[PDB]
Amino acid sequence: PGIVELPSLEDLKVQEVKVSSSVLKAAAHHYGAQCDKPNKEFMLCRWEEKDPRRCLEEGKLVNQCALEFFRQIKRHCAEPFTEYWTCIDYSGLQLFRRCRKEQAQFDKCVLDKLGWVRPDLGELSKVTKVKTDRPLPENPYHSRARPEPNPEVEGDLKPARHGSRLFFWTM
């Protein structure tokens, strides 16, 4: 069949978010609050195109928005954030319930200096709506032409011509 069409290595180069999973988990709720729109454009493009090769520009916008998010954290509230993700990072399961005072420090400094509000319980799990400008994929499964079905039955059901026609049975 056809040759698979991959993007080049220069199409995949982007400045990475080189932070740990506890760093990402510490500012996860503010990341969901502040980086909503390009992330949801990307995940809508990802569930509609069903192809990661059709989602590279949206992923690059995701990475750019995440980098601007952590640069906006680092300029204003770097030390309460470091105090908070170190305490998140200590735990094996990385509990949020173990670190509520460092969370209160980080959320206080973030609300005072950056105006960000941490979302309530239930908000990040909402199904939102996304205003895209790309067209809707007309055939994302690349489904070919379907086979035409067998013809249905029609007409009034007349009696059997001369019965069963079973050798001599006249009915």
Next chain:
Amino acid sequence: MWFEVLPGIAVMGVCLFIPGMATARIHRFSNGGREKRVAHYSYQWYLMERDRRVSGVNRYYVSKGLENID
């Protein structure tokens, strides 16, 4: 009298104290002074292998924070 049973119970209690304190100090020794990462589920393992990739020294416990970005 009855306190004569206490040296044996004390030795048995030290022998029960050694495995737990030992594995706690070993999990803090092999993980950078922290708890061992519990990866019961595949998302926790994906985050853990992402830590192993972003640390650069093939160790998940090397935490990289805001100093690793510009």
